[PDB]
Design a protein around this ligand. Structure first.
Ligand code: 9NP
Lengths: 229, 11
């Protein structure tokens, strides 16, 4: 029932890799410090996302067995997960406990950033529903690894090789849930259910980006490839 | 194509 020495090892190693990301406080201090125009916020988003993808690629290469997969399957797994991982990490940041009144200003700054009304509602519904789950740092790290190692991605040639890498992560996540929240037995199924919500963000992503209230939508060359814009 | 992605993954 408890984590085996192997599972604790995999867990601590996943956590250390995940924590090499840009710190939440760094992101929120900037946003909370002062109100920027839509033009400036779009520039902040593209620089944040470029750095996120760069760190995501590094975290992915350290996932056990990923480097043994077919080079074309590796590209499809990364391209297919980059948007979901950005929204999952943004939800983590959004839900970080801050001093009284700060998270309300954060929500106000994000609502007034330049994103269109059509995309604010599903975005905030996701962040709140993530918030209710009260996820630990390990749950966010394992869930990100599970999102990346999704065997059921379009343009994947060898699905079982991916399934074999994801299954030990699913098993660690389940045990973690059955220990951190014994009073909520659906917690594990409910985390996995939120992944189905993340997939919908990826399908309308190009449209969400182009509907930002700016005069010109400039992207970096790495984002052009990853976001298909 | 995805040449920047291919590069980052190989490197
Ligand atoms: O910087 C940010 N997100 C980074 C977080 C770390 C991983 C990489 C993305 C943006 C802010 C940009 C500047 C203006 C306010 C939002 N952000 C988002 C967010 C995310 C995507 C779109 C978007 N739009 N079109 N495609 N994606 C929009 C907003 N939600 C956040 C919740 C908490 C904290 C920051 C948040």
């Amino acid at each position: 029932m408890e984590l085996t020495p192997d599972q604790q090892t995999l867990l601590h190693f996943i956590m250390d890799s995940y924590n090499k990301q840009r710190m939440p406080q760094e992101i929120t201090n900037k946003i909370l410090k002062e109100a920027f125009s839509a033009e400036e916020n779009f520039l902040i988003l593209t620089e944040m996302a470029t750095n996120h993808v760069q760190v995501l690629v590094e975290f992915t290469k350290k996932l056990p067995g990923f480097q043994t997969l077919d080079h074309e399957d590796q590209i499809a797994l990364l391209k297919g997960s980059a948007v979901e991982a950005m929204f999952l990490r943004s939800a983590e940041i959004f839900n970080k406990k801050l001093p009284s009144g700060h998270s309300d200003l954060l929500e106000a700054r994000i609502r007034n950033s330049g994103i269109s009304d059509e995309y604010i509602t599903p975005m905030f519904s996701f962040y709140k529903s993530i918030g209710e789950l009260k996820m630990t740092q390990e749950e966010y790290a394992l869930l990100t690894a599970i999102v990346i190692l999704s065997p059921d991605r379009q343009y994947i040639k060898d699905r079982e090789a991916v399934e074999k890498l994801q299954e030990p992560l699913l098993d660690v996540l389940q045990k973690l849930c059955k220990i951190h929240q014994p009073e909520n037995p659906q917690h594990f199924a409910c985390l996995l259910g939120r992944l189905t919500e993340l997939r919908t963000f990826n399908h309308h992503h190009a449209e969400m980006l182009m509907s930002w209230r700016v005069n010109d939508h400039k992207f970096t060359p790495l984002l052009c490839e990853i976001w298909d814009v | 194509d995805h040449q920047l992605l291919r590069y980052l993954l190989d490197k």
